Amino acid sequence: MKFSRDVTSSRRKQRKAHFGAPSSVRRVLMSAPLSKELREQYKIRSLPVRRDDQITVIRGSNKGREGKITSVYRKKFLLLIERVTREKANGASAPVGIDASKVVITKLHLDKDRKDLIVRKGGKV
Amino acid sequence: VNIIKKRTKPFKRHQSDRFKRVGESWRKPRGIDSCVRRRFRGTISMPKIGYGNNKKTRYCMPNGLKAFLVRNVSDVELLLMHNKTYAAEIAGNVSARKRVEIVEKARALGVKVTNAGAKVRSQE
Amino acid sequence: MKLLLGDEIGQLKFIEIKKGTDTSNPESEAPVIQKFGELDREKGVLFMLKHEMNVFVARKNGTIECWNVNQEPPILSSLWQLDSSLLETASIVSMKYSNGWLMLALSDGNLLFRHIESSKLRKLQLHGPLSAVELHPRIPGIIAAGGKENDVCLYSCNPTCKSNIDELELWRTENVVKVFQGKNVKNDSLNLRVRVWITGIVFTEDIIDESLCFHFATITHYGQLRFYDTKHGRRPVSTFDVSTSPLSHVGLLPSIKLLYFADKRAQISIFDHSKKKVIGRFQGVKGAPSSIHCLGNVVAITGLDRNVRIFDADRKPLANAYIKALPTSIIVINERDAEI
Amino acid sequence: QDEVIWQVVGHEFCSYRIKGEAQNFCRNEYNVTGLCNRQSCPLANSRYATVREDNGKLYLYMKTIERAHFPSKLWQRIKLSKNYAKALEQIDQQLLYWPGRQIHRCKQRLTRLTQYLLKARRLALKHQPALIPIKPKQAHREASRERKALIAAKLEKNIEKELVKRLKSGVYGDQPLNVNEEIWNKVLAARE
Amino acid sequence: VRYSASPALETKCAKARGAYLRTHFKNSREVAFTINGMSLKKAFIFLDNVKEHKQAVPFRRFNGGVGRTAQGKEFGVTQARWPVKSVKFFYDLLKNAEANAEAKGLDMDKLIIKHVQVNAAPKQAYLSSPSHIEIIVAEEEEAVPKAN
Amino acid sequence: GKIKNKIVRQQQYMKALHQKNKDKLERRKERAKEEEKDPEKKRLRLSENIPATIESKRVYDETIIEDKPDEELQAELKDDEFSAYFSEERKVPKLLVTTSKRASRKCYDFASELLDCFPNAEFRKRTGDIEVHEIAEAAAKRGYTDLLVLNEDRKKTNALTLVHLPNGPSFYFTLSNLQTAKEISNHGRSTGHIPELIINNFSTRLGMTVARAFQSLFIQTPQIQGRQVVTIHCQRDFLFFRRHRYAFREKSNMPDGIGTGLQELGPRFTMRLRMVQKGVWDRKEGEVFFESNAGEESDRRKFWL
RNA sequence: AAAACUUUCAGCAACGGAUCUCUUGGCUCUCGCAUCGAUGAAGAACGCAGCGAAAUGCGAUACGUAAUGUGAAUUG
RNA sequence: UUGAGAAGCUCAGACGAGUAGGCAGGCGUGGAGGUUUGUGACGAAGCCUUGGGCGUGAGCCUGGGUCGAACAGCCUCUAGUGCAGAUCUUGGUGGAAGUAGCUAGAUCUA
RNA sequence: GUACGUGAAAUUGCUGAAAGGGAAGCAUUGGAAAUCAGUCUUACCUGGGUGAGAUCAGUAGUCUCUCGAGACUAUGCA
């Protein structure tokens, strides 16, 4: 149960906040779990996704697939993973969007900003 | 013991066959100048308590049993002692996963099921 | 990997399968089939017990032969023709190797033990209909036989001998007495007798009077996996209903020190005895499995889908191939990859 | 107690009551008759006896007024013999000087629970077809794909294509018996 | 799509469909009724004759306001007209069905108009009545001698 | 789906649909003009732009047979359970058609139509508590070769299991679109002549087993004079059963000019294979040769028969 | 009397948008707060978006510049 | 003799039109508390049906088809709670009618 | 299939069946045609034989309640 009068349990206001969120909020809304190896080595459970991240698809028809994240589609809350495509009528390959919570991060595109993020969120390297 | 029904035709609302806007469900005619209310000759019949059926055979199916709606196996087990008076009737919203287990349970209990062959096939 | 396979038409195929191969995928490298042997249904293969590096092949007509697979092509190292006076109405139900003795148990209960180097044959009469017999690997002179309406009974040649018995004086009919016989479990809830039909036997003491307490497991035609113990009592220690269809084979997994069983509905699964539950299932296997062999991490499943399926100890499909002919047995020759 | 309990449960609200048109039923597991009455209510009857089945064995359950506030020890249980005559006497001995209506209702439940176990054993021996569910999604999928398959089959085009093909190969004798003379003449000239 | 008639399986049927056609619904109902069941080749001649006023389309149901004509004696009545716009639409659809049958490899000498139905499209105080027209052409079904 | 206004996005869709129709029309008219002038660009486009169909884009499986003869495949069929039919013995098939317990009149009408398709095939009403394995063992000693059991419930036949006596494989099908002769437009009256059998599109290895089993029910010496043909056609794993009465005649479609006039005889139905068992049919304790999985049949391009 | 035509019933196809399900909307109540403008307000007009259906944003620095923060997007 | 929902069970006799009006008990709808250790993607709700059943009736249960994500029985609480009419309101749709007629061609035809 | 979830009624087209001297029209009772529910013997009693096993042992243990009441275990199946 929530006891703060500063947070709303209203489904109307929760749905409006999620679907009307700005880009700097959808960066956090699009978070993915880390693999057990990374999770117990970086001391971090989940991180927001990013391009060049290496992920494994965990749920859906494409379950078990792996690949880098070519681009994150924050408008529709979708990830676009390389070689995870669908053939069209004319044979052109249309990429398939995957929710960020349906993948797991097996390798992190480490940067100084993310390295600072790890030590910030109780992590280590 | 034989079930006697005083009437089998339903009581239709007056003038329900002339208009689609007027349903078949029985409505008491409130018109004072209505021939149906005053019960003339040739006018339709009306629901009276005289048509009420025998108390002993009331709610009884033509096979002599009373319907008992069943939603799971627990409902059908209640009829262990009343299998010669009641028939199990599985509800329409009960899935085929549970319809089969109700029918197998009702078989050992010696309970008739009114719709035991619904949403399933057989495999001998 | 490297595995050997036999078919109902009696031909032997030396499959050169390697990891990642899937014939259903058009981009996979086809395995290097090296086929030989007969092409007659009258002498189709029945069993393929792996004598160290040698392979013993049993055929329907009783033409037991030994092949050497250390070199290619394998050559018929030795041949043996079982007397047709024992196969008019019976058939070989199991054939195993223990301490230089080759066993040729039949359905009628006749047991035929053959010495390899000395070519010495000694018969052994046993109980009624036989569907599964097994020899103790560690302890010489131990037989565990069972069949339809015939509970598992343990036959012992050496009473204890306290270390071992020499091979020459083994398997005498006047020295084998049943040191343990199975007692049926209590009647079911409906006061119905639990029917007995033993289908497979395996000694599970490696995964759980000297060398007593014969811990073994049996699988039945009614989908029941029973764990026994000669010390606890003549009744099964624990009984599990692991399938509705009859179980086909049972054995151990040396990689994880566990047990596997298969049924005729094309389901092979690992039973965790410590947790008393089935953990996982070998997915992707279609058609009832004809035979299963395990050698290290790899486990090879072949069956009525005319395919050979390769898994590790964690049910991950290492390899897979299609073999056209209907198989009856499978044997893993080399667990390591071909390039190694 | 009992008359206060019955007024609260029998007439205001019981979570065990199934309200039917001709009768009310009880969802309680400890009710002998399965009906909602004053005499068959296990909650409102401080002294109560019932028979119920556990994994093929029927037991007599009894509770007394003196254990009413110890729910874990409220009901006591004894085994009823598979012999029916001995089972009836077991109820008589354990329920001695209980009202004749309560012994009557316990023996009636023993007969129905014995018949049900008998019928359960006879159903096991018999071979009965297994009921397999009908899946609405798969039926719709197979009905639509069948329509596409039948159209793509082109049965009449393929039947006559094969029938003419085997006419050319002469699967019949010298001249076939299903062909008119003029058609056979056309076949011979064309194929040669 | 699916048509109103249980035929239009691949077996022997060729379909032609026209939706929201800009023609009067009552006129098209009469033209369809005339050419229903008639051979495909004969239908082309009949539609050709109507365009040249050599033949008249008898108006049976919506016969109101249709004058007496001498060209309707073939059909047993005397109320007939010479619609052109409605006949033009049916000519376009019949050619489409004929082309569909030719592409299917159907026998073109036995094609007859097995089913033709005109339905009222959505109306668009001058709300006219557009027409939905569907045409099915199939070969005339024939028998074969049993055994003798 | 950016636009939240229904009317606006309906106007936006129509203006994009019209533009798509227009610009595709311009490129089609231009292509037609430039390819009629040069037939080369026309004859290579047709050979390159072949329309795709489910059959063409069917998933790849190695179980499919090849045109070339293979000794291993033909060595396996010469001693199997169906060998007594195709060998020099030429044992005539004796069929036993039966129904499920307590069948109705409608099941008898389908059975009576089905008995017409099979001369030398007799019906026995299923009585009491005799099981399929018991019928099979009893029918084997009576000289029967194949046993056909029609499953009906709620006054409708919905399944068909055929077993090959005495120990041959048992195939379980599910019937659908059942249609007797009276319900077929322009039907015919079947005669007593032995019908011919044509079997198509059973490419996979599992198709050979089912095609051989279906072939094994028909007498191998068809009566040519009656010119009746029974067709089993497997398209997209659907087996269509039909019986016609053909008659060769002149048609303008075929290059040779001869075509047959089929008149349907009935019954008309479809079979979907659900299970193949090695040995006599025992639903609980049978060796599964094949078991259809509905999950992987959702792939419309993948077929097993 | 069969056809046509008319009527009735049913099947299929149209027509229509009921019903059901939901919903970034409304309505109501309660709570916190005090902040427009001649230093040019509210409003109106006209312009700038590479295209944006409008709508929104912005003001010739025109769907913004500076600074700070997050740290890799934008997206039809 | 088990027949104590004592609000139950049981026995007997008489009686039966009905406007205004009086009185009693029930059916159905939206939401709320409790309950059914309730139903549901193995198909909720809705709709369709010359399928079957129950009730004197309001109504209720169910098979088949369609369908796709929620929903119900029981005790109590609550109310924007039940339609054939109001020259009712909004929407859809008919017969009148291819008529009255108004744009072409030769009163006719389009 | 963007005329896009479900898709009622009024209304319209086609097809099929039936009816039809200037109305329909509903009720009551049956016929005819079509179409449904709608069901069955399968169990009881009495054996005998064979083996089976516990709630049976001229039997031994453990656990939970409270001697004996339930749950099991080993052995015998007289």
Tab-separated table of N, CA, C and O in Angstrom, chain C residues 10 90 118 120 210 228 243 254-255 270 277 279:
chain	number	residue	atom	x	y	z
C	10	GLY	N	18.641	-53.472	-40.575
C	10	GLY	CA	19.901	-54.063	-40.182
C	10	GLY	C	21.145	-53.307	-40.583
C	10	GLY	O	22.249	-53.818	-40.364
C	90	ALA	N	10.580	-66.947	-28.662
C	90	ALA	CA	11.144	-65.934	-27.788
C	90	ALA	C	11.838	-64.856	-28.615
C	90	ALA	O	11.863	-64.892	-29.847
C	118	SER	N	37.267	-66.708	-24.154
C	118	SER	CA	37.211	-68.163	-24.136
C	118	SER	C	36.076	-68.735	-24.972
C	118	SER	O	36.044	-69.953	-25.183
C	120	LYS	N	32.996	-69.255	-24.256
C	120	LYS	CA	32.306	-70.235	-23.431
C	120	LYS	C	30.878	-69.775	-23.178
C	120	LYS	O	30.653	-68.649	-22.725
C	210	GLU	N	28.732	-57.984	2.213
C	210	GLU	CA	29.394	-56.832	1.623
C	210	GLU	C	28.627	-56.337	0.401
C	210	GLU	O	28.033	-57.120	-0.347
C	228	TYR	N	13.831	-48.681	-5.306
C	228	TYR	CA	13.877	-49.818	-4.404
C	228	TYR	C	15.064	-49.707	-3.458
C	228	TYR	O	15.936	-48.849	-3.602
C	243	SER	N	4.111	-40.729	-15.754
C	243	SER	CA	3.465	-40.607	-17.052
C	243	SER	C	2.232	-41.494	-17.076
C	243	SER	O	2.077	-42.397	-16.252
C	254	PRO	N	25.482	-39.592	-16.018
C	254	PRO	CA	26.727	-39.407	-15.254
C	254	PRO	C	27.143	-37.955	-15.112
C	254	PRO	O	27.815	-37.606	-14.136
C	255	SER	N	26.767	-37.097	-16.064
C	255	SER	CA	27.194	-35.703	-16.014
C	255	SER	C	26.635	-34.990	-14.790
C	255	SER	O	27.355	-34.245	-14.115
C	270	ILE	N	14.106	-35.771	-16.968
C	270	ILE	CA	15.046	-36.065	-15.893
C	270	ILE	C	14.297	-36.021	-14.572
C	270	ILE	O	13.598	-35.045	-14.278
C	277	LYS	N	10.971	-35.011	-7.748
C	277	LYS	CA	10.164	-34.377	-8.776
C	277	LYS	C	10.910	-34.421	-10.099
C	277	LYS	O	12.122	-34.642	-10.147
C	279	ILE	N	12.443	-32.589	-13.141
C	279	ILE	CA	13.004	-31.291	-13.490
C	279	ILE	C	13.326	-31.296	-14.978
C	279	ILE	O	14.122	-32.115	-15.454
